[PDB]
Paper text:
The structure was solved by X-ray crystallography at 1.4 Å resolution. A different crystal morphology was only observed when the seeding mixture was added to the sample in two screening conditions: MORPHEUS-FUSION D5 {12.5% w/v PEG 1000, 12.5% w/v PEG 3350, 12.5% v/v MPD [(RS)-2-methyl-2,4-pentanediol], 0.1 M MOPS/HEPES-Na [4-(2-hydroxyethyl)piperazine-1-ethanesulfonic acid], sodium salt pH 7.5, 20 mM amino acids, 20 mM monosaccharides} and F8 {12.5% w/v PEG 1000, 12.5% w/v PEG 3350, 12.5% v/v MPD, 0.1 M MES [2-(N-morpholino)ethanesulfonic acid]/imidazole pH 6.5, 1 mM alkalis, 0.5% w/v cryo-polyols}. These crystals were single and not elongated [Fig. 3(b)]. However, no unexplained electron density was found that would indicate a cross-seeding fragment caused specific interactions leading to switch the crystal form. However, we could not produce a model describing the possible mechanisms of cross-seeding that could have directly promoted the different crystal form of RBBP9 (space group P212121) with α-amylase fragments, for example by comparing their lattices. In fact, other speculations could be based on indirect effects of the seeds instead of cross-seeding. For example, α-amylase fragments could act as purifying agents, by mobilizing poorly folded RBBP9 molecules, which enabled the growth of a different crystal form.
To address this problem, we investigated a cross-seeding approach with a mixture integrating a heterogeneous set of protein crystal fragments to be used as generic seeds. The fragments are nanometre-sized templates chosen to promote crystal nucleation of protein samples unrelated to the proteins forming the seeds. To demonstrate applicability, the generic cross-seeding mixture was simply added to a sample of the human retinoblastoma binding protein 9 (RBBP9) before proceeding with crystallization.
Numbering used by the authors: 3 to 186
Write the structure that this text describes.
């Protein structure tokens, strides 16, 4: 049974408490009595190196078999790579993709150096929800669709959310509360 949520943000130097919807989602989830949504500024925030983010997820964010991991952009990539070798209660991917997009800073992360272990992810995480938008200025839909197909995600496909940089995200709250089994 899930005990907490963790937000792994996108790359970049924005404070996790105010960038996009992270702080709003944390505050909304923590309205549930006793429920923690961990969201911390990441080490190596610009390059988002796998060798730094994945240990941080294990040691400092305590991501385990009772954790719902909410990963956005680089954090979605990290959550997928994390789940190749870690049991995770559930993963909500926001703006997920599969390759370095030809960008050197994506490449520098190290997430895109070897094949995706899709079957291992699915065995380690039976509950994978995905948000994506066809007007994402950074991601081609093909890459978001590849994630949805390879991981058999519950796909919430939008047309007008871009890279999900807005400040509120009620659809995500509903998803997370469903995963927590909060009754209506």
């Amino acid at each position: 049974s899930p005990s907490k949520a963790v937000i792994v943000p996108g790359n970049g130097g924005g404070d996790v408490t105010t960038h996009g919807w992270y702080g709003w989602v944390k505050k909304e989830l923590e309205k549930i009595p006793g429920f923690q949504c961990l969201a911390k500024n990441m080490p190596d925030p610009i390059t988002a190196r796998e060798s730094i983010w994945l240990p941080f997820m294990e040691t400092e964010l305590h991501c385990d078999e009772k954790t719902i991991i909410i990963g956005h952009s680089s954090g979605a990539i990290a959550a997928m790579r994390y789940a190749e070798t870690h049991r995770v209660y559930a993963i909500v991917l926001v703006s997920a993709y599969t390759s370095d997009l030809g960008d050197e800073n994506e490449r520098a992360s190290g997430y895109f150096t070897r094949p995706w272990q899709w079957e291992k992810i699915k065995a380690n995480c039976p509950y994978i929800v995905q948000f994506g938008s066809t007007d994402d200025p950074f991601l081609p839909w093909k890459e978001q669709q590849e994630v949805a197909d390879r991981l058999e995600t519950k796909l919430h496909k939008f047309t007008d959310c871009g890279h999900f940089q807005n400040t509120e995200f009620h659809e995500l709250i509903t998803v997370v509360k469903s995963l927590l089994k909060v009754p209506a």
